[PDB]
Design a protein around this ligand. Structure first.
Ligand SMILES: [Zn+2]
Ligand SMILES: [Zn+2]
Lengths: 209, 209
């Protein structure tokens, strides 16, 4: 039954309109979010509710296990529109504990198309195989890889020419790494924020155009 | 100031916990959403709030102008994990009026990387140039293309081997087209639902494996 979702919507919209009849009218005039959320598609991680944001506040990309690839025009279009047009001040890279995409990367089952998508997280598990092996349970390994993945994705966003050119032309722009606990509703800072070119390794820095 | 978002989160999580102290505990045990939302990244279109869903209810992919490409492992991984693993019953393709991605496709400015991303919407505008030309204002042209785009994206999802193989093996799966009014908060059905192979043109139907 899809009519519930429709009936919830009319209910939601009309409730808002009696509290502030101009809410959508004003909102529809300009898009000025300060934040881009790059997070997982997982149903248990909705961005706005988690950080208490209202419509208009958060530009959002969500994909499986919040993966950012430098050949992916899907995510890169979100990042570039966020950064070059909307000129967000902040990019919130948010992974979450118990992420099935990360977990799939740590196991050996073929899931099909998504096998390719998760390659770079599988790579991360190989890179940290000594660190992860050293952890006694599967849940610990999955959860640690989740942190590692977020931290990696933050690097990926920051190395984009999109982000570096924002900085080159003096734009205020910070990239953050957070992880959400689906078990407790808490959104945790991973303290890996990047806010400028000086924070990038020499091998990854691009010269201005 | 990002600490507000953090402070809102702790506030949100602890409020929920005093209403139902098990909410996250239960939620974290299994992911069982019935819906996949494929919508735009636009800050003024958050999925859960719009249809009144709670965490756990909606698997979500959001990208610029809700574009679904058959070479995009980003979106296709979300669709395939939704369909093959989570076995969603419904895919909600939701575009929205006043979509900048659609609008960009209708104008001639180079926006960079996102130029490639929006190619297929630009194609749609060319295909319907006679219909769209025939509309007196830019806002009408943009908004009409928005409907056309949603309708197209629904076709794209339905033609995926992911979706057809769901049907081939008897899985209940419906693809919907909706459009959200950022001006009034209303989520409208475009009445283009596809629920089976019989609804696909012969040229697009794939034989079972
Ligand atoms: Zn996940
Ligand atoms: Zn849009």
């Amino acid at each position: 039954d899809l009519q519930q979702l429709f009936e919830n919507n009319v209910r939601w919209a009309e409730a808002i309109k009696q509290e502030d009849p101009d809410f959508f009218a004003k909102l529809a005039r300009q898009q000025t979010p300060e934040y881009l959320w790059i997070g997982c598609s997982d149903a248990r991680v909705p961005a706005n509710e988690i950080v208490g944001m209202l419509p208009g506040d958060l530009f959002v990309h969500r994909n499986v296990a919040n993966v950012v690839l430098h050949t992916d025009l899907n995510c890169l279009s979100v990042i570039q529109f966020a950064v070059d047009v909307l000129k967000v001040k902040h990019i919130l890279v948010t992974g979450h504990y118990g992420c099935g995409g990360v977990r799939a990367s740590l196991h050996n089952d073929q899931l099909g198309l998504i096998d390719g998508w998760l390659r770079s997280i599988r790579d991360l598990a190989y890179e940290y195989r000594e660190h992860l092996e050293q952890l006694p349970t599967e849940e610990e390994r999955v959860d640690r890889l989740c942190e590692l993945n977020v931290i990696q994705q933050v690097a990926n966003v920051s190395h984009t020419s999109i982000v570096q050119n924002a900085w080159h032309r003096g734009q205020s722009l910070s990239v953050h790494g957070c992880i959400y606990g689906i078990k407790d509703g808490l959104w945790k800072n991973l303290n890996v924020t990047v806010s400028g070119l000086d924070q990038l390794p020499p091998q990854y820095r691009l010269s201005p155009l």
